[PDB]
Amino acid sequence: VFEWFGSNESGAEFGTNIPGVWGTDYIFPDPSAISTLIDKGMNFFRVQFMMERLLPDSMTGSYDEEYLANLTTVIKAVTDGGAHALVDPHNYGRYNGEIISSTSDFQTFWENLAGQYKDNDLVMFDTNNEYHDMDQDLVLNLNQAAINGIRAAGATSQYIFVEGNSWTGAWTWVDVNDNMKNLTDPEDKIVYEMHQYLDSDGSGTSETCVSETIGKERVTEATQWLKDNKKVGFIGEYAGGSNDVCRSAVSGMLEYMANNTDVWKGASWWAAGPWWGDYIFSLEPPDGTAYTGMLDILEAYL
Ligand SMILES: CC(=O)N[C@@H]1[C@@H](O)[C@H](O)[C@@H](CO)O[C@H]1O
Ligand SMILES: CC(=O)N[C@@H]1[C@@H](O)[C@H](O)[C@@H](CO)O[C@H]1O
Ligand SMILES: [Ca+2]
């Protein structure tokens, strides 16, 4: 149906504390729980990490090789299972709490990182999670700095998932992120990643969806934008509560997208990972609320 259809794998970006310590501020996803979702048919995992944990000094400096080693382990569990792994610096366009205004530093950051992965054909690169509250020209230039660095590293087979401003939301895309059409890639493998949630404010913090059709309504304009500008997209985060109204909303949203696979390459549920507990949107097996409450809807596309 879609090129890629899967789930986020969260944990390594958890907590506020930098460094933080493994096991008390953050954890990495669990390869067994991933393997279990791969067995359900998923072929795409968006793997979260925090830049400040990978890069303890500056973003152009050297790595925490143990954090990096652990990230690469999770990526390899995915790619060895035959699935695509999207590497997501879950950073909101910010490094150490300040907006990334150095386009050159960000380019070097990505040149170094895609260097780690350049020979893995199953890796994809997400420039940054949910740019927001920042200059719209800077957003564009940071995404192009990422594409430039990634290609400079020799990573040429990999898709690059670019994000816009307004938390890369689908429902606001056409009002803020029109300049993002200007991005260019020598490999022609850019994919526009938007997020969309279904609660009253689109924050993805309530179990309750506005209506049975809210999901479709929130991705309509983005879909026309992609068509008009001859681009391809992906819903890198979505979710809904385990209840009849949201099930109807999620379903309708995915059905609409499935009718527009000319522009929609697929989606990834927010989220799986080992530290969600009783999270309203947990897709972690054996007992996450979405794992048992929503996964039957998703299996339509697997
Ligand atoms: C399963 C494993 O290796 N656990 C270690 C833990 O014993 C130690 O507290 C710390 C330092 O390396 O982090 C974990 O990785
Ligand atoms: C289960 C496991 O291997 N745990 C290790 C942990 O020892 C270490 O604290 C951390 C550094 O982020 O790397 C993890 O992979
Ligand atoms: Ca630091």
CATH code of the domain containing 29: 3.20.20.80
Residue 8 tokens, joined:
């986020």
* CA pair distance 268, 5, nearest whole angstrom: 6
Spatial CA neighbour of 280 closest among 193, 200, 209, 194: 209
The rounded Å distance from CA 23 to ligand 1 centre is: 8
The rounded Å distance from CA 53 to ligand 3 centre is: 7
The rounded Å distance from CA 66 to ligand 2 centre is: 7
Residue appearing with tokens 């504390």: 17
Count of other CB atoms within 10 angstroms of residue 97: 8
Residue appearing with tokens 């699935």: 83
8 A C-beta contact, residue 271 and residue 7: yes
* CA pair distance 51, 61, nearest whole angstrom: 11
Ligand nearest to the CA of 56: 3
**Residue minimizing CA distance to atom 7 of ligand 2:** 22
Solved by what technique? X-ray
Residue 18 tokens, joined:
């930098």
Please tell me what DSSP assigns to residue 76. H
**In the chain, how many domains are there?**
1
Backbone angles phi, psi at 130, to 5 degrees: 50, 65
Domain span at 180: 1-302
Residue 194 tokens, joined:
């938007």
**Residue minimizing CA distance to atom 10 of ligand 1:** 22
* CA pair distance 37, 48, nearest whole angstrom: 17
Q: Tell whether ligand 1 has an atom less than 6 A from the beta carbon of residue 22.
A: yes
Backbone angles phi, psi at 271, to 5 degrees: -140, 170
- Kindly give the number of the ligand 1 atom that is closest to the alpha carbon of 66: 12
Q: Is 275 exposed, middle or buried (0-12, 13-18, 19+ CB in 10 A)?
A: middle
User: Any idea which residues carry the catalytic annotation?
Assistant: 130, 237
Residue appearing with tokens 């998703």: 298
Q: Is 12 exposed, middle or buried (0-12, 13-18, 19+ CB in 10 A)?
A: buried
Mutate which of 13, 22, 65, 275 to test ligand 2's pocket (most atoms within 8 Å of Cβ)? 22
Spatial CA neighbour of 238 closest among 275, 277, 283: 283
Which residues neighbour 210 within 8 Å (Cβ) at sequence distance 6 or greater?
198, 199, 200, 249
**Residue minimizing CA distance to atom 12 of ligand 1:** 22
**Residue minimizing CA distance to atom 15 of ligand 2:** 70
Residue 23 tokens, joined:
């096991």
- Kindly give the number of the ligand 2 atom that is closest to the alpha carbon of 12: 12
**To one decimal place, what's the resolution in Å?**
1.8
* CA pair distance 69, 12, nearest whole angstrom: 12
* CA pair distance 268, 48, nearest whole angstrom: 12
Q: Which residues line ligand 2 (CB under 6 A)?
A: 22, 28, 66-67, 70
Please tell me what DSSP assigns to residue 88. E
